[PDB]
Amino acid sequence: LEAGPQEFLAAGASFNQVVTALERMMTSQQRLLSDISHELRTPLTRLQLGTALLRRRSGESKELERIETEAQRLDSMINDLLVMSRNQQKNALVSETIKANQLWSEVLDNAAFEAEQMGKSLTVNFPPGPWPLYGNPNALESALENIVRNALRYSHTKIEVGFAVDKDGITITVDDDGPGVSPEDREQIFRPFYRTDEARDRESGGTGLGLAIVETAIQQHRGWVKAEDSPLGGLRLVIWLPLYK
């Protein structure tokens, strides 16, 4: 009931208070991570001046090449971590009651514009309705956007999005006709910085935070995410989220 307490503040309090206290925790977690990310950049710049000065004095080396490319990996990862941190900030975390159609229509309309430009096709098999959800709108927008933007990239010609409602919740299914993901990699694709060796060769995306942002948002929103085989031949991503009443 106190000053800076857990969700175990849940003992007595309403569900609503319970999630705002979680957001209180989350906002500081996001501040910790963005603060550590920002600071990691400075020993890295100094380290990089060190490698530069060494290459000047004793020239190129197998060992120096390793140190330089590892330092470069770190730089990219820290950059995408701050790109995320920038975005997750910029909007206070406030869970509100929001209707599925309002929440995701803009995402889908913008995805259609992007697809049109790429020369690919986006089909919405069944659109979202005024289905009541409870959560942070920006996190859930981002959750769908990451999944459809990934699909616009890895698809060969077509993308498909499909909504389904029930007394218990909403089921969002995204499909692509591009290459899939081997069944083994389907569990790992949700890990931060996990890219398949096939996508690592492409070099047209971030360090691999997209699906990590997705898994986190959806679990925090009392739902689930799954990667499956798509009937279109590529990847199927299924989001399930509960209904609020």
Ligand X SMILES: Nc1ncnc2c1ncn2[C@@H]1O[C@H](COP(=O)(O)OP(=O)(O)NP(=O)(O)O)[C@@H](O)[C@H]1O
Binding site feature residues: 38-41, 149-154, 176, 195-196, 206-211
The full length of the chain comes to 245
- The SS3 assignment for 38 reads helix
Dist. CA 222–CA 116, nearest whole Å: 34
Say whether residue 88 binds Mg ion (CB under 5 A): no
Q: Annotated catalytic, 156?
A: no
- The SS3 assignment for 97 reads strand
Say whether residue 210 binds Mg ion (CB under 5 A): yes
CA 93 to chain centre: 16
Residue ranges in 130-189 that form contacts with Mg ion under rule CB under 5 A: 146, 150
Rg (CA), the chain: 21
State the nearest-atom distance from the C-beta of 239 to ligand X, in Å.
13
Part in contact with ligand X (CB under 6 A); list of ranges 21-29, 48-56, 63-71, 147-155: 147-155
Residue 123 has phi, psi (to 5 degrees) of -125, 130
Would you say 81 or 241 has its CB closer to ligand X? 81
- Catalytic residue IDs: 38
The contact set with ligand X (CB under 6 A) reads 38, 80, 146, 150-151, 154, 176, 178-179, 181, 189, 194-196, 199, 205-212, 234-235
